[PDB]
Amino acid sequence: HFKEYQVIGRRLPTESVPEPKLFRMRIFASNEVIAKSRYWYFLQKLHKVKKASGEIVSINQINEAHPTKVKNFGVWVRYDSRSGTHNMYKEIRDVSRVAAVETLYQDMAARHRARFRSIHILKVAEIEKTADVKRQYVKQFLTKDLKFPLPHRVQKSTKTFSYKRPSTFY
């Protein structure tokens, strides 16, 4: 389970160059230590720096603004593959950004066999207005007065032997 982290760094203040530009980014991780490590990994790719040349100035947990309102998120993803890296845009309906990126990571592993080290989360944005929601499987749930059943339900047994011949009604 994830957590969003604002992690900043400004390549250690030396002589003749005081107070550098403080490079800020939002990092999804499980804890603070992984977030820090991922941040250094991203910095080495965005420009030519190193872990020893800089310093983590502030690490902060970004709590979700309204964890009760169901949102329509659109996530820009890129990831290393069997071949070269490539962009991807998946649309996710969820309550929070942490939970939406969670469902993405499990889906990316499920459909593309990409682990945690491959995936570069670019930008997670709310899609404010519907009918601008591009993906059809998300637009599937944005219809008026959606009433759908769950036919054929399993009844979870606590014992080995039953005396009914179970009824999978709903």
Partner RNA sequence: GGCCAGCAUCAGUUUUGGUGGCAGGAUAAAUCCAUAGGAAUGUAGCUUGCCUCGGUAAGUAUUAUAGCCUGUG
Partner RNA sequence: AGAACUGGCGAUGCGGGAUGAACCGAACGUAGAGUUAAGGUGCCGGAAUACACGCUCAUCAGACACCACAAAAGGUGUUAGUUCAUCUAGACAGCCGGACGGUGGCCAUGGAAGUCGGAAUCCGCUAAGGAGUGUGUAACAACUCACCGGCCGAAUGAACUA
Partner RNA sequence: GCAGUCAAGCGUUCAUAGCGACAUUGCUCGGCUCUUCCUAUCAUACCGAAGCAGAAUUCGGUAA
Partner RNA sequence: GCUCCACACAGAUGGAUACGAAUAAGGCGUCCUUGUGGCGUCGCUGAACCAUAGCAGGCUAGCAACGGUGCACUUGGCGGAAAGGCCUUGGGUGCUUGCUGGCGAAUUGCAAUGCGUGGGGAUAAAUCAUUUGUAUACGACUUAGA
Contact positions vs other proteins (CB under 8 A): 68-70, 93-96, 99, 136-137, 140-141, 145-152, 154-155, 157, 160-163, 165-166, 168-170
Taking CA atoms, 53 is separated from 40, 59, 60, 94, in Å, by 10, 18, 21, 39
Q: Applying CB under 7 A, which residues contact RNA?
A: 60-61, 63-69, 81-84, 86-90, 103, 106-107, 110-113, 128-131, 135, 137, 142-144, 151-152, 155-156, 158-159, 161-164, 167-169
Contact 30, 5 (CB under 8 A): no
Residue 148 or 169 with smaller CB distance to RNA: 169
C-alpha 10/C-alpha 57 separation (Å) is: 8
* Residue 25, contacted partner among RNA, other proteins, none, CB below 5-8 A by kind: none
* Residue 93, contacted partner among RNA, other proteins, none, CB below 5-8 A by kind: other proteins
In DSSP terms, 92 is beta-bridged to 73
C-alpha 70/C-alpha 135 separation (Å) is: 17
